């Protein structure tokens, strides 16, 4: 699809089988969601996204469906004021900014 | 142009007569640069560049040249860890996200 930027680009996606809102954030290197359960194993990680260092849980191999497309991705769970889809997933999606 | 997201989408732009690096950030409502002296007058504004709430200088009608395109825009000057082109500018350029 083609997402306009008149509004915040917040879409409903299905992440690890659950429906969530998230913003497509080209300023974000990684994908980070607020506390929720994801399937499988995780490892703790320190990241700098995006207001101080934070400890997050990193889950690899997470199925995400976004606007009809399915990817398998690394997702961080921790303190974030918004759920954020970042460039790691956007690259997997083939997403570009076009003008 | 078509900007891919394998790396941070940082571009060199011309803003108020100066060349600056900035990141194309679909997660940012507004366009904010670090301390710079822009042309014209400004008014104080609070914004949630978190950061917590930060006081910024708001400049209106600032010319911006980005990849050969010229726009006249509102720019915030204040604390920000990077110079950010946000959606206000992107919409003026006709930017979309596409996958
Ligand atoms: Cl949600
Ligand atoms: Cl710069
Ligand atoms: Cl204000």
Residue numbers in the entry:
A (entry chain B), B (entry chain A): 1 to 99
Question: Paper's wording?
Answer:
PIs, such as darunavir (DRV; previously known as TMC114), suppress HIV-1 replication by inhibiting the functions of the viral protease (PR). DRV is a second-generation HIV-1 PI and is one of the most potent anti-HIV-1 drugs, owing to its high antiviral activity and high genetic barrier to the generation of resistant viruses. The latest International AIDS Society (IAS)-USA panel list shows 11 mutations associated with DRV resistance: V11I, V32I, L33F, I47V, I50V, I54M/L, T74P, L76V, I84V, and L89V. In this study, we generated viruses with high-level resistance to DRV by in vitro selection and determined a crystal structure of an HIV-1 PR with high-level resistance to DRV.
The major virus (referred to as FS5929R1) had two major DRV resistance mutations (I47V and I50V), four minor mutations (V11I, V32I, L33F, and L89V), and V82F. To investigate the mechanism underlying the DRV resistance of FS5929R1, we determined the crystal structure of the ligand-free state of the inactive FS5929R1 PR homodimer at a 1.8 Å resolution. The solved high-resolution crystal structure of the viral PR exhibited a unique curling conformation at the flap regions (residues 43–58) that was not found in the previously reported PR structures. The flap tip that are around the 50th residue curled inward in our crystal structure, whereas the 80s loops were slightly shifted inside of the PR. Therefore, the flap tips approached the 80s loop within the same monomer. Interestingly, the regions included the two major DRV resistance mutations (I47V and I50V) and one minor mutation (V32I), which were induced by the in vitro selection. Because the FS5929R1 PR harbored the major mutation I50V, which was absent in the other two PRs, the unique flap conformation is likely attributable to I50V. The curled flap conformations in the FS5929R1 PR might hinder the DRV access to the active site of dimeric PR because the flap tips tended to curl toward the active site. The MD simulations suggested that the FS5929R1 PR favored conformations in which the flaps in each monomer were separated, which was in contrast to the WT PR. The high mobility of the flaps of the FS5929R1 PR would provide little opportunity for the formation of PI-binding pockets, resulting in reduced opportunity to bind to DRV.
